[PDB]
Amino acid sequence: ATRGGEVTCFGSNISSNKTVYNVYNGSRIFTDKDHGYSTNVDPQTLSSKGLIILG
Amino acid sequence: ATRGGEVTCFGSNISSNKTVYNVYNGSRIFTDKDHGYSTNVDPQTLSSKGLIILG
């Protein structure tokens, strides 16, 4: 996610080695915490990069 | 609201005994402050359940 814009991928069964959820330039992502997936930013705090809600 | 998704019920006039605004699994709600209505989560905070801006 870049330059804004949400990715409301809640129950995704993602499977990859790299960082799963990525956020850049103030863009949000929303997802579940059932599967522990690597995140570019701290789970549920704002930043210069967009906010994620791993909950 | 659950698993993401917004409910921008700003000027809503609601009348019920249950909690007026509810959020689960990362959802968001934006509403007014003039009306004094119950809320499931503390208004402006990030948690496993998403923000509920009462502004």
Task: Print the SS3 string covering A17-29.
Answer: CCCCECCECCCCE
- Which of B34, B32, B1, B35 has the alpha carbon at shortest distance from B16? B35
d(CA A37, CA B35): 39
> Chain A residue with minimal CA distance to B51?
A53
Q: How was this structure determined?
A: cryo-EM
Which residue, chain included where needed, has tokens 């791993």? A54
Which residue, chain included where needed, has tokens 């249950």? B18
**A4, A26 contact by CB (below 8 A):** yes
Output A41-48 pairs: Cβ under 8 A, ≥24 positions apart: A44/B46, A44/B47, A44/B48, A45/B46, A46/B46
- What's the farthest any 2 CA atoms get from each other in chain B? 28
Bridge partners, B6 (sequence order)? B28
Give CA angle at A19 (A18, A22), nearest 5°: 135
CA separation, residue A32 to residues A2, A13, A52, B17, B26 (Å) = 20, 10, 11, 30, 8
Which residue, chain included where needed, has tokens 């659950």? B2
Tell me the chain B residues in contact with residue A33 when contact means C-beta distances shorter than 8 Å. 48
How far is B31 from chain A, CA to nearest CA, in Å?
20
Final resolution, Å: 3.6
Residue type, B20: V
Choose the closest CB to B46 out of A31, A32, A44.
Answer: A44
